[PDB]
Ligand binder design. Structure first.
Ligand code: HEM
Ligand code: HEM
Ligand code: HEM
Ligand code: HEM
Lengths: 141, 145, 141, 145
């Protein structure tokens, strides 16, 4: 559960992300696939080569969803309903993979925003991604 | 562990690392991001705020010893199990730290490296370091599993 | 996140528990201490010997907080705010220990209610306990 | 592992188990309680409701093979690692099963034994069975750690 401070922290960080959300989305996926190659098994139809345009388009979609989540921190289950349907009912993604992606995203954000990525922002973003991951892996409709 | 080209890239990156700064930082963020970890360091003084934790002199000094321990690991990548056997028993039998926490600190260290090096901590480099920290985590978990 | 089916399963199951909640609370803690003896280091001031009155008394309080929880499934963070303060701010309990007690409780319920403890009820209860655990390990005020 | 005391206790309890039935129930409960585990069995057919999973004939058949594998483990408690070496390779190299899932199945099995035996599944025996299933889970996870 996010504090008021957590939600303020998440917004402030995503505000610093700004127009680069798509790029960071792409890089987080790239790092996930490279560091944790068993994740690539959910993407057998993807071109997963280095710099693949397909990964970049998918990273943009992943970042737009998170941008959506940040505007609805008080009702993630309502905002993410359709994505839970996809990741929990259809794809049946093991939760461990959400931890791998969440970590890849913290790595990406920390590398690009060294002055904003304070320890408290890091703490808040980790809780936020865990919360998102819980929604996306839960069957609740 | 790693191919010879991998150990080479990893060793050469590691020579760039300021162990004082990075170890203080990593231990600090462990206690801030995963706040229950503070239980194991309760004699360290005030850990009630993020600034308190990161300014805490004992946290800095211990984070530096953690990284020296890791630096030692970096020299024995084919024998992490033996290298970390004594610490494995210490964290299990004396400190009762759940081994899940070993992976958390390993990940926090990767995040700290990225924060401190930006572009230079490339995805290929980070992937090799993921293999290292997972190997250290497993070596430290050996006296349970 | 719980579905409406999960919530009816939780309330129906805990209704079946009824006046045995205290007893089952104590037996969950006993099974936890016995099977996972590192959890005992959270209670160094207790007498933890077999059938300790202290453990039985502590089991009743744990059961009563779950009863409260069952009545507030749509707002666990509000309902359990004081217990979160105790477990996340004061005691600093590692989340692993919540999984151990949650499991001990499932083992306890399964053995006393073999007919009512169906795969569906088992699933809902597990979700419910995970959500309680998340609340009690999160610092959110 | 266990003392000779604990081995005979666990052995005698295990003799009461209806191996088939318990296997089906445990595998079924894993798929219902941790639903992402269904992905590994998507060839099994209908897994859309709890009833469908439990009554799925392939789930029941496979649950029997899982439990027979456990009963063999019960005979080899001093060398769980070697006993499970081929299954460790299979679940890692071909199946890509994350090892956390091994612990979940071991726990679900424990819950199933409790359900089927009630008070006979005593706190003491449950504790010893937690050692067996953590043992089997560790042996299956050998080819990563
Ligand atoms: C932060 C957590 C995640 C978020 C926000 C997220 C978001 C998304 C979005 C927005 C889509 C596109 C849906 C569409 O096309 O409209 C998608 C699809 C998908 N996601 Fe995720 N995702 C997350 C985690 C994961 C993880 C951990 C995996 C597995 C490793 C995964 C596997 C997939 C797959 C396989 C697809 C379908 C891709 C395709 O066929 O086009 N997702 N996700
Ligand atoms: C990458 C994993 C880790 C490494 C390499 C590591 C390394 C070390 C080292 C070198 C020491 C000093 C040993 C000595 O000189 O006697 C130590 C002590 C200690 N470690 Fe760790 N550690 C790790 C993970 C953790 C985690 C995750 C925790 C708790 C969450 C923890 C808790 C402790 C505590 C409480 C002490 C004693 C500190 C004191 O004197 O108060 N360690 N560790
Ligand atoms: C669903 C999970 C849990 C619930 C509902 C729960 C509930 C409670 C309740 C109601 C109290 C008493 C509050 C009072 O003083 O009146 C308490 C205290 C306490 N709990 Fe928990 N708890 C849970 C998990 C855990 C776990 C996993 C541990 C550690 C292994 C733990 C350790 C403690 C300790 C040490 C106390 C203080 C005992 C004392 O001195 O009185 N709790 N908890
Ligand atoms: C104690 C833990 C486990 C044991 C003892 C076990 C045992 C076995 C056995 C004996 C086989 C038969 C292989 C053969 O005859 O070729 C098998 C296959 C398999 N296992 Fe497991 N397993 C365990 C955990 C898991 C888990 C947790 C998962 C996934 C969540 C899983 C997924 C699979 C799959 C997908 C197969 C092949 C099924 C098929 O024929 O399509 N196993 N396992």
């Amino acid at each position: 559960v996010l504090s008021a401070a957590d939600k303020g922290n998440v917004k402030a960080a995503w505000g610093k992300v700004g127009g680069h959300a798509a790029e960071y989305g792409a890089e987080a996926l790239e790092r996930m696939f490279l560091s944790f190659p068993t994740t690539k098994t959910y993407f057998p139809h993807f071109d997963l080569s280095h710099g693949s345009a397909q990964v970049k388009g998918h990273g943009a979609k992943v970042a737009a969803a998170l941008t959506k989540a940040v505007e609805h921190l008080d009702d993630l289950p309502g905002a993410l309903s359709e994505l839970s349907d996809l990741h929990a009912h259809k794809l049946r993604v093991d939760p461990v993979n959400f931890k791998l992606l969440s970590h890849s995203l913290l790595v990406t954000l920390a590398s690009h925003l060294p002055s904003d990525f304070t320890p408290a922002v890091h703490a808040s973003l980790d809780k936020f991604l865990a919360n998102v991951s819980t929604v996306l892996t839960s069957k609740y409709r | 562990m790693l191919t010879a080209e991998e150990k080479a890239a990893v060793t050469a990156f590691w020579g760039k690392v300021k162990v004082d700064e990075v170890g203080g930082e990593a231990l600090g963020r462990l206690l801030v991001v995963y706040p229950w970890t503070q239980r194991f360091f309760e004699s360290f003084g005030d850990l009630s705020t993020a600034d308190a934790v990161m300014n805490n002199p004992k946290v800095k000094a211990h984070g530096k010893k953690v990284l020296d321990s890791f630096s030692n690991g970096m020299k024995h990548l084919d024998d992490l199990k033996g290298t970390f056997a004594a610490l494995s028993e210490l964290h299990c039998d004396k400190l009762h730290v759940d081994p899940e926490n070993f992976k958390l600190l390993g990940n926090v260290l990767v995040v700290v490296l990225a924060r401190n090096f930006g572009k230079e901590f490339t995805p290929v480099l980070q992937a090799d370091f993921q293999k290292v920290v997972a190997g250290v985590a497993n070596a430290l978990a050996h006296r349970y599993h």
